[PDB]
């Protein structure tokens, strides 16, 4: 059909001619590679589709128009906005109660698209009262009463209500949605678990208050389990959620450790996927940023050698994260812990990254070495450590930095040269 033929049909007072045109429009919007969304908007059809959502009598045209509008709302912000301006949100929310499951579904989907656009339309969908009727659909006794296609859409739309910052989702909305997300995180469908993990990913990406909310529900254990799933779509978000939680307080970080996250991290730190390695090493760095007893659990779960090898073998983005992990460790750790780091052969692969062209990272490594030297001083083993650094070719790279553009680099490298180059309570 032409867009003209669709308009002529929709404008007909004949209810069957309207359905036929809306079918034709649903096809243009779904089957086409380059859909004529802008043509349909300009033809002034959005308001008519939106009122077809209200046609209880003819549930076919409720469904067909819900599809059409889904796909229009799936475009650019201009196109989504066009649908919202056409009054679509409260009409979709009304359809959530539809006794026809597949129409409810399409409304769940449509609302998901709108909420996905950003913080504005997210907050708006909530304002129109989308939460109560959405959670009500997952309020059944047994989750497996719902078809898996219908359930994935609900979980996805729910994740979009948890998404974005500036501002974050309203607290009242998060408090209400979380109990359902806990229940969803124990479902055995991979796609649902990925969607749920994404939701919790977004909720933990904020200040400690928001993290506290997630932690109190008791989901950290179950996330740690999902950390070691086969399905990479589950691991990626689950790891990001865990990473976000350890950005919080020492007590919040401990929940993660207490939940046995450190057992799974060897496979994360050596994952086939670059992205998982980075994120794992980033997560590690935030734990080596913590209390000395937390550093000791990193040591106890045998992870230090894994960080040492990530620092050697990984791509640069990941190596940067290892630099941070190692330096945080040297900053917070006891002399005993630093000795152990040296024994795992940190010195060389760390100092190798001094030839990196990243002024920030260079300063972080020189700090690490400064910290290690202070541990050495307390043992009276600055000579031994000097000689180990010379043997790792690290002295050549420190005095190489005395011809660097940066002044912090120049003076930090100088102070090391001047100062130091002129049981586990020894570096042997």
């Amino acid at each position: 059909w032409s867009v003209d033929d669709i308009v002529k049909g929709i404008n007909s007072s004949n209810v069957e001619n309207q359905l036929q045109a809306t079918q034709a429009a649903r096809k243009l919007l779904s089957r086409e590679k380059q859909p004529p969304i802008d043509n349909i908007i300009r033809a002034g059809l959005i308001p008519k589709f939106v009122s077809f959502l209200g046609r209880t009598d003819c549930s076919p045209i409720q469904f067909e128009s819900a599809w059409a509008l889904t796909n229009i709302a799936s475009g650019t912000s201009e196109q989504t906005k066009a649908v919202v301006d056409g009054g679509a949100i409260p009409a979709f929310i009304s359809l959530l109660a539809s006794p026809h499951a597949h129409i409810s579904e399409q409304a769940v989907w449509a609302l998901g698209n709108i909420a996905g656009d950003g913080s504005v339309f997210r907050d708006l969908v909530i304002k129109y009262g989308a939460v109560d009727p959405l959670l009500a659909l997952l309020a059944v006794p047994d989750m497996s009463s719902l078809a898996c296609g219908y359930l994935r859409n609900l979980t996805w739309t729910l994740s979009n209500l948890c998404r974005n910052k500036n501002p974050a989702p309203p607290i009242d909305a998060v408090e209400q949605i979380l109990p359902t997300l806990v229940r969803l995180l124990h479902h055995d469908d991979p796609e649902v678990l990925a969607d749920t993990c994404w939701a919790i990913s977004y909720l933990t990406d904020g200040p400690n208050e928001r993290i506290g909310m997630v932690v109190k529900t008791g989901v950290v254990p179950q996330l740690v389990k999902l950390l070691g799933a086969s399905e990479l779509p589950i691991v990626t978000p689950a790891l990001r959620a865990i990473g976000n939680i350890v950005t919080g307080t020492d007590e919040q970080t401990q929940v993660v450790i207490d939940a046995g996250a450190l057992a799974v991290f060897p496979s994360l730190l050596t994952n086939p996927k670059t992205n998982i390695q980075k994120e794992a090493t980033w997560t590690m760095s935030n734990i080596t940023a913590g209390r000395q007893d937390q550093i000791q659990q990193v040591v106890n779960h045998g992870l230090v050698p894994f960080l040492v090898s990530v620092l050697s073998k990984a791509d640069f983005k990941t190596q940067k994260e290892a630099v941070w992990a190692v330096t945080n460790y040297t900053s917070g750790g006891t002399v005993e812990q630093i000795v152990y780091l040296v024994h795992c052969g940190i010195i060389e692969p760390l100092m190798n990254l001094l030839t990196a062209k990243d002024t920030k990272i260079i300063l972080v490594i020189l700090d690490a070495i400064s910290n290690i030297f202070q541990a050495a001083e307390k043992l009276g083993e600055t000579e031994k450590l000097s000689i180990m650094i010379e043997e790792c070719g690290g002295l050549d790279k420190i005095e190489a930095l005395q011809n660097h553009e940066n002044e912090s680099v120049y003076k930090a490298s100088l102070s090391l040269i001047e100062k130091y180059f002129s049981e586990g309570y020894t570096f042997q």
Binding site: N71, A289, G332
Partner: peptide
């Protein structure tokens, strides 16, 4: 040397989906 927040995410879930 304290806690550091995340970069941007490389592999993002869909914002919007069309039904095809």
């Amino acid at each position: 040397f304290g806690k550091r927040p995340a970069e941007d995410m490389e592999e993002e879930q869909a914002f919007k989906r069309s039904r095809n």
